[PDB]
């Protein structure tokens, strides 16, 4: 919790305890400190937990995961009472940048659990030994958990049978809209969301009080809350440490008047402009870690990093006249200028972290490293310019996912360990060159690049084959064991996975001669998809739906903003939706999930506005 | 064309020039004896069991600890 603790200790007033009923109404005021209306949920977050907990005992099948997450959505539902729109935000198909660190980890929980039942066989044969009994394929894959894997499309069907189910028997749900974004909808779930964000709020439609609530427990979500600019907006998380199940707001609103304190500034060159303070600090929040990038070795959380870069950053703003980003595009000349900053006082960060291998804190640190990290040394410079700048490449990659959508789904970072600020000279001349046109990946392409030889059930019969036997033409990408340095941190998880970066060329060429073996159901899967709104009877835009539902027509079709509260968008017929007046048989075989007997809901295509 | 064009068009920018080396010298030794696709696969092989340290199939070692041998000379 990171970077949390820090935000949390530093302005504390920006958490407020969630109330909560310990047979609940929804439709009643919200007992929380503020009525809610959207409330978006980062499903990832919550699929995790509940398919594979590490704390409690595991579920018994699939069947049993699928409640514990209806039972999971329908229990931060009843806290927020969103009186307007509920969106539901799977994982799709990542850009590259995300898929290296995807692969890292897919390829670390395999190891995991084979060195998992390397100990239970350990324990099992030491008592044996000793003289106690011990009792007697069936676990679960929590990689399976990935856009294209039969699992997921499978959760996706439990899914709709939920906003069914929910919407016609919910009273509570009787006038919201409900979004759904599977996993064949391309973009992390959390980057959907925020892209719902920013297409609504550039439509005049849309309501600038919509009070926003986010559910996650990734950090980056405070930023995302910031960047999106709007007004109100929030976040709801489980507590950090608690002896129960206790639920906390962010409340970003507040967190903005504590930053607009911090960062203000006297004898500015150029307008003051809060707003855009407020981009550069998420830059800078982004600077000292995210997805995408190594963290520079002389920024840790811990360490004050944040504290640091905006005394740095306070310091350059009295030097080159305005903003050290503009919409997301960061101003290449100033990051210099704060890396050369920052380089000035690497050395006395590893000295003062000493008191508490490579040397870092000794003279000499970066010519062992750039030799223990990277194998080069003293004589080649333009190396350490080289990750530099493929560095900030990525710093304007980020800042520009954030804020206007993905910039490449190509590019990706190409090293296994950061530079230190002081290589960021020269950084200044590089224009950054997003323009070449890029498309994701199907899902089965990626789950090829993401998974390791342990998780091939997942994948088309012939295309395992490619994975495992010898004379497959990419075994290499396939390794069954890989060493973990762990540079310096304490546990293994800390450290840098030693993967070989997949050779996105030479995989597509290997799948050209497989790809006809797939199943109409593989090929259904490897589809990119659309995503799907949802209202009751009741809504007042259930008769304009249900005019677009029986139209029977894949034309687009305008929304009327007046009847959802402002939002825009288009929506379109569905031919997999299951019609109102029908029964809606229960893909879930658990007591709590029984048949709809007959299904109150429509379901159409969704399309954010352009 | 060529060899040695062929080969060289293989680097990676990001690749380090003591490894460019190493997975040249690979290449080289092999040309001629495996299609394009194969000797990318296998060149790769080899540099990521000695350089990165990861494990392979039995078999695949032993293939590699073959055709690696002597590419320190």
Known sequence: ?610 | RGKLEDVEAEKKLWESDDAWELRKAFMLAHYDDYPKIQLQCLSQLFINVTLLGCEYSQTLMQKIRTMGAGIAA
């Open chain 1, 1 to 610: 919790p990171a970077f949390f603790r820090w935000l949390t200790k530093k302005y504390p007033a920006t958490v407020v305890n969630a109330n909560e009923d310990r047979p609940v109404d929804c439709t009643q005021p919200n007992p929380n400190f503020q009525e809610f209306d959207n409330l978006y949920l980062d499903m990832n977050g919550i699929i995790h937990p509940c398919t594979h907990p590490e704390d409690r005992p595991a579920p018994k099948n699939e069947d049993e995961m699928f409640a514990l997450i209806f039972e999971y959505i329908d229990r931060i539902y009843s806290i927020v009472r969103p009186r307007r729109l509920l969106y539901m935000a799977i994982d799709g198909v990542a850009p590259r940048a995300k898929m290296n660190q995807q692969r890292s980890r897919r390829f670390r929980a395999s190891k995991e659990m084979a060195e998992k039942e390397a100990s239970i066989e350990e324990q099992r044969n030491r008592l044996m030994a000793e003289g106690i009994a011990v009792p007697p394929e069936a676990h679960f894959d929590s990689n399976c958990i990935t856009p294209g894997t039969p699992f997921m499309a499978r959760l996706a069907d439990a899914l709709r049978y939920y906003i069914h189910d929910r919407v016609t028997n919910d009273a509570s749900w009787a006038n919201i809209e409900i979004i759904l974004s599977d996993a064949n909808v391309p973009g992390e779930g959390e980057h959907k969301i925020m892209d719902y964000v920013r297409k609504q709020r550039g439509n005049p439609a849309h309501d600038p009080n919509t009070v926003h609530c986010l559910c996650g427990a990734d950090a980056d979500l405070i930023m995302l809350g910031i960047a999106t600019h709007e007004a109100n907006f929030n976040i709801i998380r489980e507590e950090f440490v608690q002896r129960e199940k206790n639920f906390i707001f962010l409340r970003i609103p507040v967190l903005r008047e504590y930053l607009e304190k911090e960062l203000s500034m006297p004898n500015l060159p150029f307008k003051f402009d809060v707003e855009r303070a407020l981009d550069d600090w998420v830059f800078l929040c982004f600077f000292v870690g995210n997805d995408f990038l190594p963290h520079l070795p002389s920024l840790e959380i811990r360490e004050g990093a944040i504290d640091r870069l905006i005394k740095l950053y306070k310091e350059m703003v009295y030097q080159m006249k305005g903003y050290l980003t503009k919409d997301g595009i960061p101003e290449l000349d100033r990051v210099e200028m704060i890396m050369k900053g920052l380089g000035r006082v690497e050395d006395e960060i590893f000295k003062r972290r000493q008191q508490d291998d490579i040397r870092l804190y000794e003279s000499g640190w970066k010519d062992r490293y750039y030799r223990a990290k990277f194998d080069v040394g003293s004589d080649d410079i333009e190396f350490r310019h080289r990750v530099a700048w493929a560095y900030v490449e990525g710093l304007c990659w980020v800042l520009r996912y954030y804020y206007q959508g993905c910039a490449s789904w190509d590019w990706y970072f190409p090293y296994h360990y950061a530079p230190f600020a002081s290589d960021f000279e020269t950084v200044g001349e590089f224009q950054p060159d997003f323009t070449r046109p890029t498309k994701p990946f199907n899902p089965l392409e990626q789950l090829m690049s993401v998974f390791p030889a342990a998780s091939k059930q997942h994948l088309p019969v012939e295309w395992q084959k490619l994975m495992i036997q010898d004379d497959s033409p990419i075994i290499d990408l396939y390794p069954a064991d890989f060493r973990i340095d762990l540079n310096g941190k304490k546990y293994a998880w800390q450290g840098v996975a030693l993967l070989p970066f997949v050779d996105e060329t030479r995989l597509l060429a290997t799948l050209q001669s497989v790809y006809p073996t797939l199943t109409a159901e593989e090929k259904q899967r490897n589809t990119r998809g659309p995503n799907r709104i949802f209202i009751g009877r009741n809504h007042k835009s259930f008769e304009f739906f249900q005019q677009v539902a029986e139209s029977k027509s894949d034309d687009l079709v305008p929304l009327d903003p007046t009847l959802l509260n402002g939002v825009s968008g288009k929506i379109a017929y569905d031919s997999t939706a299951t019609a109102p007046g029908l029964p809606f048989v229960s893909p879930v075989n658990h007591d709590e999930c029984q048949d709809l007997p007959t299904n109150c809901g429509i379901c159409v295509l969704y399309e954010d506005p352009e």
